[PDB]
Amino acid sequence: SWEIDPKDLTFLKELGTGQFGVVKYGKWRGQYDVAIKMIKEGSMSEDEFIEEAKVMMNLSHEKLVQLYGVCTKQRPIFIITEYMANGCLLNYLREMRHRFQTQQLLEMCKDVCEAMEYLESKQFLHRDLAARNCLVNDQGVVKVSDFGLSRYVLDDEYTSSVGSKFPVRWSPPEVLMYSKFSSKSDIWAFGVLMWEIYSLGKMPYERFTNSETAEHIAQGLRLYRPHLASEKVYTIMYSCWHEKADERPTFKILLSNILDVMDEES
Numbered sequence: 001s002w003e004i005d006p007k008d009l010t011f012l013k014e015l016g017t018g019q020f021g022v023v024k025y026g027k028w029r030g031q032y033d034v035a036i037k038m039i040k041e042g043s044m045s046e047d048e049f050i051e052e053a054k055v056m057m058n059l060s061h062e063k064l065v066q067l068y069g070v071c072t073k074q075r076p077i078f079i080i081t082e083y084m085a086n087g088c089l090l091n092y093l094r095e096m097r098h099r100f101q102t103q104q105l106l107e108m109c110k111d112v113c114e115a116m117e118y119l120e121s122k123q124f125l126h127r128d129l130a131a132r133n134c135l136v137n138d139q140g141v142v143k144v145s146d147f148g149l150s151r152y153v154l155d156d157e158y159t160s161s162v163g164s165k166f167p168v169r170w171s172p173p174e175v176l177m178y179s180k181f182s183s184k185s186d187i188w189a190f191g192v193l194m195w196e197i198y199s200l201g202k203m204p205y206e207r208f209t210n211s212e213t214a215e216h217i218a219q220g221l222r223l224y225r226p227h228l229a230s231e232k233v234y235t236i237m238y239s240c241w242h243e244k245a246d247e248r249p250t251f252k253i254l255l256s257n258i259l260d261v262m263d264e265e266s
């Protein structure tokens with residue numbers, strides 16, 4: 001059930017490169033748009049991923065990027081997914097021509113929060129939630145991408161907490177200090193993602209290094225209010241950054257808060 005025949009794929013366009021190498025746009029059976037991860041040799045724990053892919057095929061939500069299947073008979077292996085025409089959310093936010101209204105920004109947060117609440121309901125962590133790992137479709141709907149795949153990355157610079165590619169600026173103190181990953185580390189990251197959205201893709205803690213960020217957030221320093229965020233919106237993102245993990249909200253609570261602010265500020 002999980003296995004796509006790669007001969008059914010027509011490759012049409014380069015979409016760029018990620019942690020596992022090249023990603024392409026194409027058609028499945030000459031008709032249906034797909035994206036194809038071509039998994040670079042040595043980049044992935046492949047056997048483990050493949051066993052997990054069986055489970056990930058059951059995860060389905062309108063705001064999650066849909067896994068269609070995998071090609072695992074030949075190397076490089078392929079991950080086939082839903083295609084998102086407007087690319088990654090970070091680059092989308094950075095294009096100032098969009099001149100987003102604040103209601104549109106809050107809708108982007110809601111899109112992500114819905115996906116994350118779904119994943120929360122299935123006891124499934126993202127582990128690398130950030131604007132760079134969200135995608136945007138042709139209707140401007142934001143969807144969460146590459147949830148769970150951090151587990152199969154073989155690159156020590158990505159995996160190590162002091163590595164060059166580790167998401168230090170999206171991580172809570174307990175992740176950076178003790179590697180305590182939980183629903184609440186995703187909550188922290190989501191707060192940072194809200195900040196990214198309202199900051200139109202600025203780097204979190206843009207004047208600090210990763211090392212300086214780690215020490216500052218351990219001392220209780222936080223990100224502060226983006227110009228485009230109302231006090232009510234800022235309260236929601238800030239609530240994700242409680243020092244004590246158990247005092248952070250759930251995604252269900254965040255979703256209710258976002259919906260309330262939509263009713264109050266629209």
Ligand SMILES: Cc1c(NC(=O)c2cc3c(s2)CCCC3)cccc1-c1cn(C)c(=O)c(Nc2ccc([C@@H]3C(=O)N(C)CCN3C)cc2)n1
Binds near residue numbers: 014084088091146149
């Ligand atoms: C998800 C993705 C990545 N990222 C990854 O593969 C990984 C991230 C992580 C991994 S692997 C493991 C650990 C966790 C983090 C890289 C390149 C393209 C796409 C990608 C995928 N899909 C499913 C798309 O629909 C898509 N769309 C897209 C991309 C670019 C453009 C377009 C373009 O063609 N170029 C060349 C530049 C930007 N632009 C907007 C348009 C659509 N991109």
